[PDB]
Design a protein around this ligand. Structure first.
Ligand code: CL
Length: 544
């Protein structure tokens, strides 16, 4: 039926110069040695990504799909969604969102400057007036960092990002922001994945697993998911949006954005040249995450019905899916998964690695992460979220004239606090660096490092400071990632941690509380860690 993209043959070009690694990486050359292995995707590889995501889709739906979609619209019809004022939409624009072609950017939009508001008013007018003319978009290579992997072909090519002008992006929110905030929860319930913190994600997967008499689980890796979303899926999304109770102006806007932007359009490079034409999901529109989550969910739940998955409990996150169900025995479970893959493939959601059933929760990886287990201070099993530390370590070593990795370190320390790699490696390094810089109470992206113990207790529980006897998989993977990146082994981080702990303790105050709580693992004579009052008086509902 339809190709995902066409190409004029024009280069996908950068926005200015993309920047060289340097000969010394002073913040990270004591963390790891093999800096040669750390790389950033650039436009030089955009052409190669284009090839991998340009292909034919044909889609065949069926009674199971139709039934799931019908249930979903009924669930949607219980939502009431308001327009946002132009001004509210403007205030929701992020601080460094890409500037508009019409002589203004994020700062002007967020201060409701006159010409910004004027332009947006006219953009919105035209959305109400013209429900047809395709809206132009810019195509760019994303710049992301990874560690080279010879197993899987050296260096990944850059992902492509496709987006309309800042004015339009503001309009999208006027039409759809309230929906983006209400629909997934309304349509999917506990299955909507973005509502959970790591600890909660673990709790959900564990309750799901315990509820089945003989559980089986799998993840579904979907290949270039954005490229496999069809016009029809996109129009079916509009149709789900339109099931909700909406003002009429919203409807026209939503319909018009659907037909003019979402469904597809032409793509221009940064130098202005016509680059191609798109008939799939754009990465850089407001509905991307919501859309992918909803469509992935419909397709997947239909596939479960097609394939005979019994009593399924799902967790969905854009293109990432995990399903835990009642096993029918291995021979059948293998059969049903093959049926699932066949159904998804028919629905235009074909797999990357084909799925496989598992009967141990540590062996299921989704959102690049998995559940593992360790023991707590009183001897009890403690489950937590973890992941391969390779890419976090590579990004911990990305250091240029224009980028500092310290933030990235902190993101991982918080999200993955209970892991052995965060506790023994990243935490040891982060504090060591800040101490020597004497910047231990700077403010990183809104967080004050000396509050970590509070924050971690709130997010992960006090047991995060007292876990031991990590799993074989985890010990193996962490040892192996350190070796792969030429970082010191754990043995050495332990010495470094003893030293970092001492200096923290010796400065008293919140620093010493960090030393005591965060590095209790590093000393023979364990202190008894008690709840932190500063932690009760703290609400991080905001972040998840
Ligand atoms: Cl315990």
């Amino acid at each position: 039926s339809s190709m995902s993209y066409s190409w004029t043959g024009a280069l996908i070009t950068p926005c200015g110069p993309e920047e060289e690694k340097l000969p010394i990486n002073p913040l990270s050359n004591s963390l790891l040695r093999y800096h040669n292995k750390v790389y950033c995707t650039t436009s030089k590889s955009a052409s190669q990504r284009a090839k991998k995501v340009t292909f034919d889709r044909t889609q065949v739906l069926d009674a199971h799909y139709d039934s799931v979609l019908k249930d979903i619209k009924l669930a949607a019809s219980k939502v009431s969604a308001r327009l946002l004022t132009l001004q509210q939409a403007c205030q929701l624009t992020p601080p460094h969102s890409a500037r508009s072609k019409y002589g203004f950017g994020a700062k002007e939009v967020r201060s409701l400057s006159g010409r910004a508001v004027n332009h947006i008013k006219s953009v919105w007018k035209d959305l109400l007036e013209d429900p047809q003319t395709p809206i132009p978009t810019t195509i760019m290579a994303k710049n992301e960092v990874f560690c080279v992997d010879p197993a899987k072909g050296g260096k990944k090519p850059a992902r492509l990002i496709v987006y309309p002008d800042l004015g339009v992006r503001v309009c999208e929110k006027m039409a759809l922001y309230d929906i983006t905030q209400k629909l997934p929860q309304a349509v999917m319930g506990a299955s909507y994945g973005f509502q959970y913190s790591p600890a909660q994600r673990v709790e959900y997967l564990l309750k799901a697993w315990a509820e089945k008499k003989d559980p089986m689980g799998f993840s579904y890796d979907t290949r270039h998911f954005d490229s496999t979303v069809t016009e029809r899926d996109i129009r079916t999304e509009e149709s789900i949006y339109q099931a909700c109770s909406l003002p009429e102006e919203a409807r026209t806007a939503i319909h018009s954005l659907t037909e003019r932007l979402y469904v597809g359009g032409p793509m221009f490079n940064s130098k202005g040249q016509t680059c191609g034409y798109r008939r799939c999901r754009a990465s850089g529109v407001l509905t991307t995450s919501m859309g992918n989550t909803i469509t992935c969910y419909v397709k997947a739940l239909a596939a479960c019905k097609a394939a005979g998955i019994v009593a399924p409990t799902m967790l969905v996150c854009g293109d990432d899916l995990i399903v835990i169900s009642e096993s029918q025995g291995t021979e059948e479970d293998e059969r049903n998964l093959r049926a699932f893959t066949e159904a998804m493939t028919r629905y235009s959601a074909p797999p990357g690695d084909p799925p496989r059933p598992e009967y141990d929760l540590e062996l299921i990886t989704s959102c690049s992460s998995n559940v593992s287990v360790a023991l707590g201070p009183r001897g009890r099993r403690r489950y937590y979220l973890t992941r391969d530390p390779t890419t976090p370590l590579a990004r911990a070593a990305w250091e240029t004239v224009r980028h500092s990795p310290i933030n990235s370190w902190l993101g991982n320390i918080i999200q993955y606090a209970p892991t052995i790699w965060v506790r023994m490696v990243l935490m040891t390094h982060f504090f060591s660096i800040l101490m020597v810089q004497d910047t231990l109470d700077q403010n990183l992206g809104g967080v004050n490092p000396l509050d970590l113990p509070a924050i971690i207790e709130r997010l992960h529980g006090l047991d995060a400071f007292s876990m031991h006897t990590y799993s074989h998989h985890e010990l193996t993977r962490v040892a192996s990632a350190l070796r792969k990146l030429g970082a010191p082994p754990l043995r050495v981080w332990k010495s470094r941690a003893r030293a970092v702990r001492a200096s923290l303790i010796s400065r008293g105050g919140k620093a010493a509380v960090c030393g005591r709580y965060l590095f209790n693992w590093a000393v023979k004579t364990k202190l008894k860690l008690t709840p932190l009052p500063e932690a009760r008086l703290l609400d991080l509902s905001s972040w998840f």
